[PDB]
Amino acid sequence: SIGTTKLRLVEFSAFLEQQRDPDSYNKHLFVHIPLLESVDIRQIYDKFPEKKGGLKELFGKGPQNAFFLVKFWADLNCNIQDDAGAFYGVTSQYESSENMTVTCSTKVCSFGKQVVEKVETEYARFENGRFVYRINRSPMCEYMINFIHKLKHLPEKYMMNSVLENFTILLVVTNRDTQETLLCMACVFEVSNSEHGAQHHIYRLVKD
Ligand SMILES: *CCC(=O)Nc1ccc(C)c(Oc2ccc(Cl)cc2)c1
What we know:
The protein is mainly beta. It has helices spanning about 55-60, 140-155, 155-165; strands at about 10-20, 25-30, 35-40, 65-75, 85-95, 100-110, 115-120, 125, 130-140, 165-175, 180-190, 200-205. The protein binds N-[3-(4-chloranylphenoxy)-4-methyl-phenyl]propanamide. It is found in: Nucleus. This is Transcriptional enhancer factor TEF-1.
């Protein structure tokens, strides 16, 4: 799932950690993570950067099989109250057969222009016969937290899906030493209506 032979995505969790007292805590998940359906990559070009270093140039440069598309169904049903000890975090994990230095570039884009870019570099750890790259408790950007607050204030869910059409996040995982594309996840977001659930669909990007 969401992976090639050279790199595999194990877990992708974006959460909100809350504590009202040491007696009772709670971590609420916004999004959580063998043949993939095919989606034309040209359909999502406008939503992601088209300039140098954009999704289009990356496709030509990098391997075609490494690119994917994810439709996240985000769970926005959570009580947002006092600041207290609240933490917005993204925990990711990648496991790979080969040893390398991995760079995780998270670009949160609005209206097809990158607003905030988070570049992180992780070193290899040998665990259970493979190399596991774990990015633990990435503190969420102040932009993204204020963004989530902007969503929850919206009265009707149908409105949220409308603004989120312009909200995209392009994960690009790269080998630092070789400058080779290892994995790429174009993510689009929609709200899922449920008492407590999160859904996600994964597609493979192709040019045809
Ligand atoms: C600001 C850094 C960051 O990691 N932002 C980020 C990237 C990806 C994902 C999936 C995040 O989690 C959410 C995105 C969108 C919504 Cl509506 C909810 C959570 C956050």
